[PDB]
Amino acid sequence: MSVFEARSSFLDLEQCARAAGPQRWEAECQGVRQRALQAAADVMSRECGAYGDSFFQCYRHGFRLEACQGEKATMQLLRCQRMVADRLVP
């Protein structure tokens, strides 16, 4: 749920994957995978929830508001998600 915990989750995932191998990883390493994805998802929701709520609001109001004009309402969210992924998975 924190960035540290999610990073440790992904390290567990990668080391157990190197242990298992490229052939049986999806079979052997499902629980660690789900834990890692859930932690990364918590981090993503925490750090990008404002932009998602803003997009939700613009969608409710038909993108009629000032802040909904253009594509920033979407690009901000996509940039947050890209940054979170680049910060977590590598």
């Binding site: 609001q57 109001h61 038909g62 009629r64 000032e66 004009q69 594509e71 690009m75 940039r79 890209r82």
Partner: protein, 226 residues
């Protein structure tokens, strides 16, 4: 690696989300064009309305510094208002994005004191307009709860109607303005309450004999009333 490739079909296919976007990006897919919503209707501050106020058509004063440019309702609208949905009607009386009078408090105790003295509610100051769907969901939930509370109540739909009118008038952000619209239904509920009590507890009165000139004219019909 480009960001948001599959996410702008509105751009790839020249689809405008609104006539303002159509006019801006020059897609020209709206046959009737676009009459822009002016800035005084797109944003602004709360104002006083009544003629029996001295600071009428003046911005509401707050403890914090706030832009004093007011939202101006549509007083001389065009004849053809092609979109008569709630989305386009609400813009004639409120701004969809809410008012521009919100604070950013440097401290928590200023917020506390404003609330304690009755000068701030985030419900009122940090909020947008409600969509028709949201209004309908709220109204239907309230109606369900009231029907569960008592089906055999005559003031049921009157209470439901005042709730509906408050929601439609956006009482979260203009409570005084909405109460001005809804007190009629509150009064009707107040009447229905007594009308129900007097039926439950049999309450009646001795009516006097008929007046000599109950009828204005002998040839006139005296329609009988309970």
């Amino acid at each position: 690696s480009i960001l948001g490739a599959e996410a702008f079909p509105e751009l790839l296919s020249k689809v405008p989300l609104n006539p303002q976007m159509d006019e801006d990006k020059h897609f020209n897919k709206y046959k009737w064009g676009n009459e822009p919503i002016p800035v005084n209707r797109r944003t602004g501050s709360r104002m006083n309305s009544s003629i029996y106020d001295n600071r009428n058509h003046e911005a509401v004063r707050h403890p914090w510094s706030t832009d004093a440019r007011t939202f101006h309702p549509n007083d001389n609208p065009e004849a053809d208002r092609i979109n008569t949905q709630y989305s386009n009607m609400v813009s004639d009386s409120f701004p969809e994005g809410g008012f521009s009078d919100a604070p950013r408090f440097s401290s928590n105790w200023e917020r506390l004191l404003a609330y304690h003295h009755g000068l701030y509610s985030p419900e009122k100051f940090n909020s947008t307009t409600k969509t028709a769907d949201e209004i309908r969901l709220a109204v239907n939930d309230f109606a369900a709860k009231v029907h569960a509370d008592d089906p055999k109540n005559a003031c049921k739909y009157l209470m439901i109607e005042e709730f509906k009118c408050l929601q439609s008038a956006q009482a979260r952000i203009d409570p005084q303005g909405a109460a001005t619209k809804c007190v009629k239904w509150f009064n009707e509920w107040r009447q229905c309450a007594w009308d129900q009590e007097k039926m439950v507890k049999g309450y009646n009165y001795i009516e006097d004999r008929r007046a000599r000139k109950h009828k204005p004219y002998i040839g006139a019909p005296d329609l009988q009333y309970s």
